[PDB]
């Protein structure tokens, strides 16, 4: 019911047709759900009010509480197919500096991993993406990290000389 005029003028007059125009259809189309309907949908979505902890931002205390930082996203798919080979992303970005409980494992972990171990903040991000899923990938990564820590607790005999 909105006779909106759409079209480029000819010379010195008024845009073209009145009702449905080709341009109007070419628009991504957002006529549905007006601000009133938007407020209605927002009042409907008002549910789900889960609390969140105030662990102080700055990317410091958040990692101190839990050093691991897994990424479990949910991209949007295209076309009529939902199979989107993109939900398997996973990285075990655990802050080793937050741990800080390595007596002799400092000389072991520095060598047991190549492209890791920084200077300011130890970002132990062992990209563990071997299995064809995400949650079990993270589980296997945590298990491997625990096994490595348990093995480093009793360092070898020739690990001192480097």
């Amino acid at each position: 019911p909105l006779p909106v005029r759409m079209g480029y003028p000819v010379k010195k007059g008024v845009p073209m047709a009145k009702e449905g125009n080709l341009e109007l259809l070419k628009i991504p189309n957002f006529l549905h759900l007006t601000p009133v309907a938007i407020k209605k949908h927002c009042e409907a979505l008002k549910d789900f009010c889960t609390e969140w902890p105030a662990a102080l931002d700055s990317d410091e205390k958040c990692e101190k509480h839990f050093p691991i930082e897994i990424d479990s996203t949910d991209y949007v798919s295209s076309g009529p197919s939902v199979r989107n080979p993109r939900a398997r992303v996973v990285v075990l970005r655990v802050k080793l500096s937050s741990l800080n409980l390595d007596d002799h494992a400092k000389k072991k972990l520095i060598k047991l991993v190549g492209e890791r171990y920084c200077k300011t903040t130890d970002v132990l991000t062992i990209k563990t993406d071997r299995c064809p899923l995400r949650r079990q990938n993270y589980d296997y990564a945590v298990y491997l990290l625990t096994v490595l820590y348990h093995e480093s607790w009793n360092t070898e005999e020739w690990e001192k000389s480097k």
Partner: protein, 87 residues
Amino acid sequence: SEYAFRMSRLSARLFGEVTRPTNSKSMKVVKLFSELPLAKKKETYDWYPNHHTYAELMQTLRFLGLYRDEHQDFMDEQKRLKKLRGK
């Protein structure tokens, strides 16, 4: 380095990966044996539709009277005219 080689061997024994080092020319063979080779790309069998089942579906739709085949019908008419003039 000898120490680096021994450390890598120990890690592989613990982690469960390749132990001793060697030429890096094995990655290509590993990829060609396990990963995709060359002809099985994502845009090969799908690069061109067989157009057999699709052609049969279009023919069935035309028979049902809910489709249009302008180029095909025109070519058939031209072929009929040529045959009448032929041969």
